[PDB]
Amino acid sequence: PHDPSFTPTQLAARAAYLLRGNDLGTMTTAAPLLYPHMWSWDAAFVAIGLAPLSVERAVVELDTLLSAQWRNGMIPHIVFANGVDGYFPGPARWATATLADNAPRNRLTSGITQPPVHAIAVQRILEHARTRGRSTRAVAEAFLDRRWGDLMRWHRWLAECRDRNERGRITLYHGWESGMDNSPRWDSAYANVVPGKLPEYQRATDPSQRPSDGEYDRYLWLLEEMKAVRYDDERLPSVMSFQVEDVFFSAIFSVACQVLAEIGEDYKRPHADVKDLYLWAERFRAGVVETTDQRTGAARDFDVLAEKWLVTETAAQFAPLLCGGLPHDRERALLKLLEGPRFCGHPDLKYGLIPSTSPVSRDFRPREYWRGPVWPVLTWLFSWCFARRGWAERARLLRQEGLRQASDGSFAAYYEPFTGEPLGSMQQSWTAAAVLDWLG
Amino acid sequence: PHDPSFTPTQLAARAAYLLRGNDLGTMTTAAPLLYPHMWSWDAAFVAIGLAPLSVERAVVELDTLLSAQWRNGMIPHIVFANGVDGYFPGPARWATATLADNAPRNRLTSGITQPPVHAIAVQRILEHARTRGRSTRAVAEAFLDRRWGDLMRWHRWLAECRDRNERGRITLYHGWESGMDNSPRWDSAYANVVPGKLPEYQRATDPSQRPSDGEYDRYLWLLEEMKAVRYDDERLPSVMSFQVEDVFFSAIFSVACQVLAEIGEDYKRPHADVKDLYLWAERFRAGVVETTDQRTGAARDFDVLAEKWLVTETAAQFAPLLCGGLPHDRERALLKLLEGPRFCGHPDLKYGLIPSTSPVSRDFRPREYWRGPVWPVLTWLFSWCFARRGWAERARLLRQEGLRQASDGSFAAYYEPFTGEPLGSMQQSWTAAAVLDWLG
Amino acid sequence: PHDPSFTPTQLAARAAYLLRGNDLGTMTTAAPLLYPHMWSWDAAFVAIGLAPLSVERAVVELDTLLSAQWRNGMIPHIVFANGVDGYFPGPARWATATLADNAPRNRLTSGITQPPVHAIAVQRILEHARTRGRSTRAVAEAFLDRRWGDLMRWHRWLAECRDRNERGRITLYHGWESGMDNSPRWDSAYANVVPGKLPEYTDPSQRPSDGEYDRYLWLLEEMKAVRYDDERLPSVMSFQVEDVFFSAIFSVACQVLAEIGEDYKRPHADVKDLYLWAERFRAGVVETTDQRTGAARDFDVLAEKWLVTETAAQFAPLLCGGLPHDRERALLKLLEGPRFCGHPDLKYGLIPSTSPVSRDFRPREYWRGPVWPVLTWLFSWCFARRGWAERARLLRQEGLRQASDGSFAAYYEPFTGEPLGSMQQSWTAAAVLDWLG
Amino acid sequence: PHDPSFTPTQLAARAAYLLRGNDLGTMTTAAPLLYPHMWSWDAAFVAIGLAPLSVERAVVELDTLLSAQWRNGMIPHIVFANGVDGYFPGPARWATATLADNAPRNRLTSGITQPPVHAIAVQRILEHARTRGRSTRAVAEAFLDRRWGDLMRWHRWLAECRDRNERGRITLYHGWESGMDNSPRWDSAYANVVPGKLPEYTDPSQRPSDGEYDRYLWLLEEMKAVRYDDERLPSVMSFQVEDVFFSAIFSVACQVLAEIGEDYKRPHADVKDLYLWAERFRAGVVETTDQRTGAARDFDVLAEKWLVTETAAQFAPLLCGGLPHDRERALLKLLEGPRFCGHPDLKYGLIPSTSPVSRDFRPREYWRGPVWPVLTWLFSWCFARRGWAERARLLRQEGLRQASDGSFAAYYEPFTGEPLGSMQQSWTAAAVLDWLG
Ligand SMILES: OCC(CO)O[C@H]1O[C@H](CO)[C@@H](O)[C@H](O)[C@H]1O
Ligand SMILES: OCC(CO)O[C@H]1O[C@H](CO)[C@@H](O)[C@H](O)[C@H]1O
Ligand SMILES: OCC(CO)O[C@H]1O[C@H](CO)[C@@H](O)[C@H](O)[C@H]1O
Ligand SMILES: OCC(CO)O[C@H]1O[C@H](CO)[C@@H](O)[C@H](O)[C@H]1O
């Protein structure tokens, strides 16, 4: 009635209740009905949410994902659950099991990748484990013995196969790989995707957050282009109608390289690996900074086919705040943009949180996935990265507004920015995980 | 390391994580390895722990239990999970499916009962539901429409078949029905149980909490006596070697009748049912008070076969504090006994909690189930009943010490009284449920 | 900017900070600027708020109030601080130091009383002291040794001088003694107070009326003319009401003090009297109740008629008990329903001082509608003592949510939640400190 | 009885209650009975503790300290309250009002300084004020308008008069100026202070030695003989040390104040100077460090030698940054290992003031081993600013667990957790209030 919010203990309990309800055994669904499989960067957040509940089970989540890693190091963005068909495109449509030389042998997966937040999840598991007993430390340390090499091959695949020209930015061949499927970031690149003869498909709820058929036809056509060259890394530059450098993905990778490097020093991993990681951390920091607006510090994506900077007003333009590297004066301008009336300081926002697209941008749509709504997962990543920059009060304020928004217990993936209405899929594992990590 | 306790939010999260991990679908195991089935009074506490997480799932827990209710109204103490054999005595040994005319038709159960805390769980679900929306109230109210009659038949079976002489005390035919299997309360009655030819069985861990073979032979022999008369209520007085009036069970039933009566008035249930419930509430209140020591107010059990009051120093002698009814001066003496050096005020206790047996009793064993250890479930029941008597500060202090003891996150069924070592089965659902209910 | 509420720890800190800032040394002001003196039932609540901070200082608060007790046992409603003349009426107007044979020496006080919540404060001090160990228990026990007799004389004066006919209800000679100055409860009794020639003496939506105040001051002239003599007041006072809310509080207080007296081995004759008064005033409260709804009525002794009004005072029997089962259920339904806590426009699930559907309701005017944290606290504490754990918890929860702006207002607008009246009110901080635990 | 710890809300309440009880009006005593005056870095911490309770009163605390600033910019370490002579040495002994040309008018102060944590307090006030809305921001901004110039003159006096050779380290003329009076850091420098004829002037395990105190007072005689003249002190002082911990705090403070100055559009020349000092003192701190372990060393200017000791001051470079990557990792390993936070007998995971394995360690003696909440607070706050979120959180967590007895002791026994020394210490309450949020 008068107050529908949960207390912190009720909220923590309900978040943990959801995470365990979404557990199929050794993988956690991204969401029970919409996304009934393991998604890659969701699984990293799930591992973060499991760490305060069970270090052993958090480690199992990353083990399951890394058992689906391709032979070339790519972590695919979906690991399908042995039995479920309530999602399209499914294993039959990707056909990676038959076409992809590098596909894993006892897992069904997609053929594209997703942001490398995984090292951040490894850090959170290790921080939790060190506060628990010796036996919990041993569990976390055995995971590192077993999976350090796999984590290196993941970072190396990105550094070498998605940055072939050592520009320090990650090339994507599908908007799905950015994690922000329908971000205005990718509109002009998608306008240059022309579907050919497209195999007959079905569907993949509220229309104001319902794909868009023309948009979805383009998503599926990129799959056809990859399948035609059997997912061969070497051929994709020649055939893909979509080739972008993702500056937000690149900044995340810079941070992840630095985090994994620090892990490798703390746990006496090979010196040559730690050196490679610090090298990539700096290269991708510099590649992010090279994209930035000279007055505001805002980061731009790059259309590799058109050879054009992509100027849009989304949360991705704050990529440099995550990895650092801007000159002092430009970073102050960028923080001013973040806090001002185009983003967190917009007067109609219910919470002091980062909308996915600026409310004043012409591309803004308050209900439409990444075109405006506030995503707890982005709140979490900015808060954690800000605390790492030393901006304790900034990170605290994001956490506090994030908890206030989450306190209805809907665990929605994203929220209407002006009304706070929970939108889209409820029961989203990574929102439960963000809440659990914040509540401590 | 320096502090192994969990914060309140971490503890609430881990308690909810455990409850969902023990969920088989529509029933929750009492404990995943020792007790991998639904136990009756555990299931009432589980429903209490589920109510803050999901009213719909809490209602499902009681629906599953009441679907196993016998045709005469008895709620059996175990409802076996369709597939599991890691417990003995199992469905084959009870043979209620073949022998018991009143056994349910599509469930396997035991042939004895357990304390009627179920109405208390119904009250907690309704209190939670009323703080949530209209749709959650509707779920709880439909449960009452569907199950009010079953709850009445349960209370009526106890009032009419286990108090045949309207003495206002419940007769038990097995110590297992008290919930306190090996309490010193039952030693002298068990000494008069002489096993005959006993069918060959196997076993049902640390020896200081390991049944006792002679004790277990007597438990199993009572089953043979019930099976020989096909669980017929009318024949058990003539054949059972164990027949006790349980004053703690009787006080719980008094409270439960009063609670269910108040529920029936609030939700406009039949007037004749509410009248019957208030009648039983007073009859069993008076029956508890009739047993009490004239100086200390301490309640005694009664051996129906020997026609002897059973004088022991266990937590059961505080039965009158739960249901009320003592003269003012004797209730003050009883509270003095509870708080003094024989129980909560004993100088060697780690927590200000109620040991199951007095540390100064000769029957005291600090590790041995109900012969001494502190059980969170008993802490919960006394705290809740005390708050209902209006003793807010007393109930608060029990809750606070209970949370301090539970804060290691072991969720043990019982704890060593002097060291606080968690004992016995870990991962006990009803301890997780007590914690969740306390934390709010 | 986006969320002006304080966390529980910030709110507890600010509450404690306010209470200490209102401390003059041995007394705490009811509110620093509007009420810069010690008020009687405010001081009991302040002692409750101090008990988690310092058992010794909570005891001092009660010691200071009891040092102002009148020779006949009466606790006066104002104990004036050494000399702020920003409050009126002050010592000169009351003239108790010269006219009242029973006034204390070396304290300046008023000549009227206020509700006896003091035993409840004593219980909370003892409960805190028992969680704090040996030397803190000794402080609280020495207080009982020092003041048990004075607390008895307070309760005896109420029972014997303000219930002369042993009706089980307290008679008041001024609406100020109810604690609810301008409650619609007293409108018809004040309407019959016709004053004579009277000696020369913020937001108007929150203060009583200038015509209402000539009546308030005229009653004082009547008491002064008979030198505040107990035996003469029934002959002269133009205002004589039996206050059923005051009476229910007294019944609870007697029961509470009787239990303290048993726990600390006070004289058996005192404990017996306290139980007798607890039962007498319980019955007196029940005798006023509507037989359908259970609602308690005040009684105008001069007019010889029941005062039927729709205020929170109707719920007096919930505090002390004693209603038949069916009639108490009906009274709870009234409390929870749309005339009170269930009114659809209330911001919080809290008890408004007057029913929003009553013609007497005024959403900003003091006791004519606003929600008072001190009433919430008293209802929640009495409900918990009845065993209504969930009802008590809901009142506490909503009271904390309402208080979490940190204004510590004495009362709030029932629809918008706007803090009203005096800010920085000591007993609102005390309520918050006791709730937060 | 079974659990004497307080809940977070009870502890926040008691902390705020203590702070207000130590308020004299415009200054807060460092501790009511042992230190009944305003101390300089205590006052900065008090301002931090007040900021959640009242931005206006936190600003007053800093306003009062800055009103005692010397004409040359120096903030003295004691500002005496109107007249409690229970502290010694007091105004008569310091004689600054008569001898010191730069002493303030109408304040009585000491003639020495203390570490410059003041800019950190200003940052916390501003951060609180920005969460509280328009009129509270205006209070904090008006403070900056009023006192920016004075804060600059404080930092300029340190940089120019206490680092005359532009070495990037602050010179001290008294161990009292380090804030760590009896730290083993100063043992060999004090051993070379040989006093002359000196004017006539609790638990001994927690206080410095009577021979140690003749040296403390002799240094004062030397300063007085040259009338506290900055230009003459290097010629006369028997004690001249470069304090690497003070220097690291200064570097942090300069950086913090530079960022404030940018955020509120202070003069560009001030901001530039503050960044220059922040970098100069960072480098000066790094120049003292052991190349294997990173541990920072103090320097005895008279003896011309590095002071190698095992105290928490060794960790100065963690506060301000600037160490090479490998050397900072080694220093963190020292901090976490068995010589400090990892010593197996420590009750809490907290930084002891002296290493328990050092021959200089004394578990009850002041800065020779005990754990000081104010050091925990400063390390945790600086660590969070380095981006070490988890390390900062662990220090805060253990500090709260240690503080949760509510003694508010200045320091604790590192093995048993026994509160030691003065209870009711304002800056321990302030630390708790800031942590609890
Ligand atoms: O078709 C929807 C899929 C495609 O991968 O994407 C959405 O749900 C995923 C699972 O929660 C997230 O990983 C993405 O970030 C989000 O955009
Ligand atoms: O053999 C052990 C069984 C027999 O029923 O009993 C124990 O575990 C049950 C399930 O947790 C509880 O219901 C009982 O109270 C407790 O004594
Ligand atoms: O006219 C104002 C005075 C006069 O007694 O009364 C008001 O303030 C008092 C001090 O807070 C309370 O004690 C009363 O309850 C409240 O009505
Ligand atoms: O001799 C005691 C004085 C003299 O300055 O110093 C101690 O108490 C001060 C007041 O709390 C602190 O400021 C110091 O840090 C601490 O060492």
Residue numbers in the entry:
A (entry chain A), B (entry chain A): 2 to 205, 211 to 446
C (entry chain B), D (entry chain B): 2 to 202, 211 to 446
Reproduce passages from the article.
The MhGgH monomer displays an (α/α)6-barrel domain typical of glycoside hydrolase family 63 (GH63), to which MhGgH belongs. While the active site of GH63 members acting on larger substrates is located in an open, solvent-accessible cleft, those of MhGgH and of MgH from T. thermophilus are covered by a cap domain (subdivided into A′- and B′-regions) with constrained access through a narrow negatively charged tunnel.
The structures of the E419A variant in complex with both compounds and that of the D182A variant in complex with GGlycolate were determined and help in understanding this behaviour. The most significant differences from the complexes with GG/MG are observed at subsite +1. In particular, interactions with Tyr36, a key residue for active-site closure and organization, are always absent, while different subsets of interactions are observed for GGlycerol and GGlycolate. Any deviation from these strict interaction patterns will result in a decreased affinity for and highly reduced activity towards the compound, as observed for GGlycerol and GGlycolate.
